[PDB]
Known about the structure:
By secondary structure, this protein is of the alpha/beta class. The protein is built from 10 helices and 14 strands. The termini are far apart. Calcium ion binds next to loops. Belongs to the leucine-binding protein family.
Amino acid sequence: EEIFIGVAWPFASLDDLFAEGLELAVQEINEQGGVQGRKLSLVKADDEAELEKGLAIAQAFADNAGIQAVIGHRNSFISIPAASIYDQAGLVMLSPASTSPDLTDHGYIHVFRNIPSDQEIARQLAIYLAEQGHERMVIYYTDDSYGNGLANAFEDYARAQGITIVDRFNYYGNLKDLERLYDKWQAFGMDGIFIAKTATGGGTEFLVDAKSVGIEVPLIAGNSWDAGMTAEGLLVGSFFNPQRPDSRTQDFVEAFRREYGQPPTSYAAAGYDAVILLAEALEKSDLTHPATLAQGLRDLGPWEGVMGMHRFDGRGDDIGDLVVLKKMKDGRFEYL
Ligand SMILES: [Ca+2]
């Protein structure tokens, strides 16, 4: 017989390699006797990155008895409200893409994340920049949920690490405004810029505008830049190191290269680990009643995954060493 886990993701509209990590993992689990003798099967639901469809899917998984746990969703604006539904149903929701601090700030007991939050990434960036001797910086943020969340965290940890935020701003109307801003920043003694704007939503246009004006200081960004050559030197805080020395990572990278003909993405890796994580917790619990699964996950760790060690706190955040800092160099990522 079978055990099912649901996956909620914008499958059709995305080519992120996430489904390929999933497929690879399921395969590996089944070809070793599966889980408790049972074969593992995914029930895929496409949320189209739309809140209405996201919520309907969450609902549908909640009142389907065969579902042990759900993996998803990709977007924080869907995951936060969807978590409400899984938590009320006693169903474990394990998210591999949603970085918002707010996801684990509501006392939900069955809600999990297998990647570092925007907050943990921001903290590691602050530590790194300060260790490099960065003293005075400027933040470029967007006034929305992601922008504010990431900017806020970085401001905090930056002060905690000795860095002065000399300026923050969320708008410039044209290149001469950016020229005026930069004159001001030079007077402040700015030595770096943190971009808390998504890459597709204003981040990259700013990269271009900033080169064009003559800005020389290092540039730093968050997760949404893991997904042209003027980004040289851009430091990105993300996760998954495909050059991590351990045999667990190299086996995965090799197996993936073989089957798919390209290196894995961090979403593919997050996908892979989520399935293995859930299967491994599942091999140890009572499938009779899937709300023992949550406590299962908090005693599972540490669990060696393709991304590094996984360990959950009581809020459900992943708090193992998983943040990977990446610098752009000649088109590809270097790892520090
Ligand atoms: Ca200082």
